[PDB]
Design a protein around this ligand. Sequence first.
Ligand SMILES: CC(=O)OC[C@H](O)COP(=O)(O)OCC[NH3+]
Length: 19
Amino acid sequence: CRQXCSFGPFXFVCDGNXK
Ligand SMILES: CC(=O)OC[C@H](O)COP(=O)(O)OCC[NH3+]
C-alpha cells in the first residue's frame, strides 16, 4: 500500500497506510 494520509485534515502528513 502507499502512505499519503487517508484520514487527515489535508492529505500530505501521512499518519497511516492502507489506501
Ligand atoms: C504538523 C502539522 O502541521 O500537522 C499536520 C496535520 O494537521 C496533522 O493532523 P492530525 O494528526 O489530526 O491528522 C493526521 C494526518 N493524517
